[PDB]
């Protein structure tokens, strides 16, 4: 079926969803899951590194994640949005392709993959889940205390 | 089942031909060390400890050669090293070891037709190498090993005369 | 044949059960009883060395759970009513809850094991090998516990603390 | 098998009490997983309630919790549970959670939750099926009450006067 | 789990079907670039390429030119971009002349008419892109 | 050895290493019996186990002494 099932929880699906949903709906769910995990991993790494190492912008932007983005200039935000939009139109074209594999920009249906490929895909998925929880935790902590992750840990 | 440890099986190497055999080899060194090498080492340590015990006891009692320091056995090593005549006890040890142990050691390691460990054929008086006198040698040597260990670690600990106990004969005999 | 394994197999250096094999069941019952009380007492010593209950031992008296030492002095500093309550609790638990002898002395249950005093509601291992191993460790821990408990009692009698000098 | 599982509390309903229909669309493996989570919550709640009762009443060890940080059990007990706890080293807390994590990793590898709905390897006290189901139901009811009790205690001490009694 | 296989199931072609060469991302980006996009006429391909290159060609000359620290820095940069674009389209025209000597098909980059249309689109697009970049850099205060 | 805490730490580290070690896929933690380990590896099982036990014991003892825990 898919790769997400793991030892600690098994096939975690209390509330249905998987059944009574179209294959297109399942592909959309897995694409959204992988996108969330990847973006959350990027956010976690960015917050962790930018807490204690932010050389850009003359080192003046705050370590608070929720205020550093406010202090970033408008042109930088526009360029980041343009880059993300370009990545997303590539994702849309990949969706329109007839051999789409939710989340697989690499292809990977055209190579002799084995169980190690599924294991590594599960590694990506579980790290993405952990980052999904962690990034929202980081943002909530920044809103509450005003400190970033590592500053809070101090 | 070994005769000494009645809940373990004796090693095949020990058998019963060697003198002093009692099936005592719980951790089986005899498979990783040749038995002849182990026996040579056993007899060397046993003989050195027998001589060490008798010499320590004699010097503590007061038997001293002329011109030597008049000190107890605990400080005798330092006193002899300071006074100088202590490398000439190493020199005969050096020639004996270099010219009898190293060749004998390599014979035991390599040669199949070699004398057993600890056998130098040293029988001037011809008293005899019977299996009673080998058993007596081994038993006395093992007792001397344990006795020397006790003597040194008690003399260094307590710093007292020949009994090497805090109270004296009173610890060996609590009735006193 | 339970009890007998280890460094020393059967070990009857005076031949009690060898002379009187009919009394082996009684001796096993006594051994298990002593081992059980010994494990309880040893755990009591270990846990009283570290943890003491908060609260008054008796409102009528001026004694707290913290003022008692851990030993004969601690048992001495209890009200007689509390001591009587302890004694009657032990009496009920040993007479009606866990009677080793169905009837009189030397009359342990033939159908049940010598130390089978628990009721229906108890942990049971439905495997002969596992049951045998668990009973063997039970009796062996009982022996070790009672030897150690005699050690603790003598140390506390002599010095005052169960731990001896280091 | 929502009806197969033991836990239907006659006090609230003769059958399974699922107001919001969360088990209507659920797999047998996920049902076992949810029961395992319920049992783990139950068992943690009872132990936490007993720990609260012991630490709040004044029970504590006789000692120092860290030689290099000047900590003691008596200070934690005097501070209170919510505070005293806050009064523990972070390293000791991480060691406690690491021990619990090692136990959970070992037990989940040995006894997967989806395969075994909280049935770990501890021995059984009764083999009669009727008594077995009665004991399981008693466990679940006691643990439900323990969950409610520990949350009530937390709300009582954190927010004063939030529970009628708080013994 | 092999990830490098023969190119188009041909072990004896001098290529490999690596993730870089053959992955869906590479295929999508390349096939959707103007030079490979489907349905675009050669004029449209040349136009898109032209504006894309002429927009960025001004910047090096503007910032790092000899007259960077002069009031006419941007004008000099634009003239430099225009000259470079003139050289580029001259290169394109002579390349078409040398390569597509005899041809009558048209509507294909590998034909004389198609390459001429592509070069025309490139020239117009590059001039327009350089001019637009000049306007943006003049009105940089907007951003 | 001098201190009872040091002796306890060294003994615990040695026992932990001997229990959790694995040679060629065989170990006590991996459910290989003591008698089978003894026959397969001999006193090499104790020598390596206690050598690494002493290494980890030295590491933890020196760390605790540096941290003041001991
Ligand atoms: C929003 C992100 C997201 C999405 C889209 C999915 C999607 C999927 N997961 Mg899930 N998953 C996620 C996050 C997500 N997951 C996280 C963070 C974890 C860690 C606990 C897991 C753990 C997990 C496991 C262990 C497994 C799956 C599986 C699945 C698949 C089947 C279940 C399904 O249809 O869910 C649909 C999900 C949604 C529609 C998302 C919204 C859900 C509700 C409406 C709201 C959010 C819930 C809750 C309020 C959380 C926020 C509160 C707080 C924490 C802030 C599907 C591809 C299974 C699989 O792949 O089997 C082949 C599987 O085995 N997931
Ligand atoms: C590092 C140590 C460690 C490890 C490896 C685990 C591992 C596990 N725990 Mg956890 N657990 C830990 C510490 C740890 N626990 C501690 C210290 C406690 C307190 C006693 C608990 C109490 C606990 C309970 C009560 C439950 C688990 C469950 C689980 C399992 C699911 C994890 C999950 O989905 O989390 C996801 C975590 C969240 C979504 C955040 C929860 C935060 C709440 C809302 C506050 C998994 C076997 C669950 C289980 O077995 O389910 C079948 C379960 O029911 N754990
Ligand atoms: C008093 C509440 C209570 C009850 C009724 C039960 C009942 C049960 N537990 Mg237990 N359990 C409890 C508290 C309780 N538990 C707590 C607080 C913990 C954490 C230490 C556990 C941890 C635990 C585990 C890890 C497991 C069980 C399991 C069991 C079953 C084993 C048979 C048994 O001994 O039952 C009879 C129990 C009693 C008569 C309670 C006696 C208590 C007094 C104070 C002594 C049974 C359903 C096993 C199972 O299969 O669960 C589904 C299992 O694997 N329990
Ligand atoms: C290779 C080394 C080098 C470098 C770095 C420079 C740099 C420079 N020279 Mg030059 N110069 C060099 C060698 C070099 N020179 C040599 C060998 C000579 C002797 C003949 C000269 C003689 C010379 C003179 C006489 C003058 C300069 C000047 C300049 C400046 C502007 C030149 C200009 O307009 O460029 C225009 C460049 C471009 C239009 C394009 C450059 C390449 C682009 C940026 C590459 C981008 C690649 C991209 C990442 C690919 C992937 C993209 C994909 C992912 C989408 C600049 C500082 C002028 C000045 O004012 O100096 C301060 C000047 O008057 N140079
Ligand atoms: C749980 C017990 C324990 C404790 C409390 C400590 C504590 C300590 N160890 Mg460790 N240690 C332990 C177990 C323990 N060790 C064990 C079992 C071993 C294996 C034998 C070691 C082996 C070891 C070594 C070899 C070293 C330490 C060092 C240290 C100190 C610095 C650690 C650090 O942050 O490195 C700094 C953090 C880094 C990321 C350094 C990165 C360096 C690379 C080359 C880049 C610290 C006092 C170091 C020291 O200086 O001790 C005084 C040291 O050199 N330990
Ligand atoms: C009831 C129900 O439903 O389920 C139950 C059923 C069942 C079967 C009962 C269960 C169980 C198990 C239980 C309750 C087990 C309890 C076991 C127990 C309580 C075992 C104590 C041992 C103490 C010893 C050996 C003491 C040695 C003491 C020694 C060696 C000493 O001499 C002490 C000392 O030398 C030191 C160390 C330090 C030195 O300075 C000197 C001194 C002298 C001071 C379950 C399965 O868990 C649940
Ligand atoms: C069938 C048949 O015919 O026979 C059968 C049946 C029959 C007759 C019933 C049997 C029996 C029963 C028998 C013979 C039982 C014997 C039991 C026995 C012999 C029990 C000793 C306990 C000693 C203790 C607890 C000592 C504590 C000692 C303590 C706490 C001290 O510290 C004492 C102390 O002095 C020191 C050490 C030092 C001083 O500074 C301080 C003080 C003064 C305080 C047999 C054997 O089954 C044979
Ligand atoms: C009318 C009323 O209540 O109003 C108010 C009062 C008050 C007080 C304010 C309130 C509260 C709090 C409440 C209600 C608290 C409830 C607390 C509750 C119900 C606490 C159970 C503990 C059970 C334990 C610890 C069991 C351990 C059991 C263990 C460790 C075992 O020995 C079991 C076991 O070893 C055996 C025997 C056999 C072996 O195989 C192994 C296992 C592990 C299986 C409320 C909510 O406001 C309501
Ligand atoms: C062995 C277990 C045991 C059980 C099963 C048990 C049961 C009951 C029951 C229920 C059936 C009641 C109703 C009850 C009542 C009281 N118990 Mg009691 N009790 C046990 C043990 C002890 C000990 C050791 C002491 C003690 C005491 C008191 C006092 C006195 C308080 C005071 O002094 O103010 C009162 C009122 C203390 C005492 O006698 O003090 C003079 C004391 O030391 N109990 N006790
Ligand atoms: C889950 C229970 C648990 C277990 C199974 C367990 C096992 C072991 C073992 C293995 C046999 C060793 C060898 C060991 C060693 C140390 N433990 Mg540890 N420990 C547990 C719990 C706690 C708590 C709560 C604390 C603690 C501590 C320390 C300190 C440092 C003390 C100091 O700071 O002076 C040292 C050296 C304290 C601490 O780190 O305090 C900052 C502290 O508070 N432990 N601990
Ligand atoms: C992919 C990618 C990348 C890259 C990028 C790029 C390469 C970019 C570029 C960009 C650019 C380079 C842009 C451009 C633009 C342009 C424009 C916008 C133009 C316009 C123009 C116009 C509008 C014109 C007009 C005209 C004409 C046409 C002619 C006549 C005149 C006039 C003026 C009218 C990177 C590395 C980041 C990484 C990730 C991925
Ligand atoms: C993207 C791409 C590519 C490439 C890449 C790379 C990685 C690089 C490049 C590079 C390059 C390609 C560079 C260039 C450079 C240039 C320069 C450096 C120039 C300069 C010039 C000048 C300076 C001029 C001047 C003038 C004028 C304008 C006119 C008159 C005369 C004079 C001289 C005055 C390829 C092909 C692969 C493919 C397609 C795409």
Automatic annotation (TrEMBL), chain E:
Keyword Iron in record: no
GO process annotations (BP): photosynthesis
Database matches in Pfam families: PsaL
Keywords in alphabetical order: Chloroplast, Membrane, Photosynthesis, Photosystem I, Plastid, Thylakoid, Transmembrane, Transmembrane helix
Record field: transmembrane: 49-67, 74-98, 118-137
GO cellular component, one term: photosystem I reaction center
SUPFAM superfamilies: Photosystem I reaction center subunit XI, PsaL (SSF81568)
Record-annotated Photosystem I PsaL reaction centre subunit XI domain positions: 4-141
Signal peptide interval: none
Cell compartment(s), UniProt: Membrane; Plastid, Chloroplast thylakoid membrane
InterPro entries per UniProt: PSI_PsaL, PSI_PsaL_sf, PSI_suXI
Membrane topology label: Multi-pass membrane protein
Chief localization: membrane
Family matches, as PANTHER family: PHOTOSYSTEM I REACTION CENTER SUBUNIT XI, CHLOROPLASTIC
Family the entry assigns: Belongs to the PsaL family.
Protein name as annotated: Photosystem I reaction center subunit XI
Annotated source species: Isochrysis galbana (Marine planktonic alga)
Gene encoding the protein: psaL
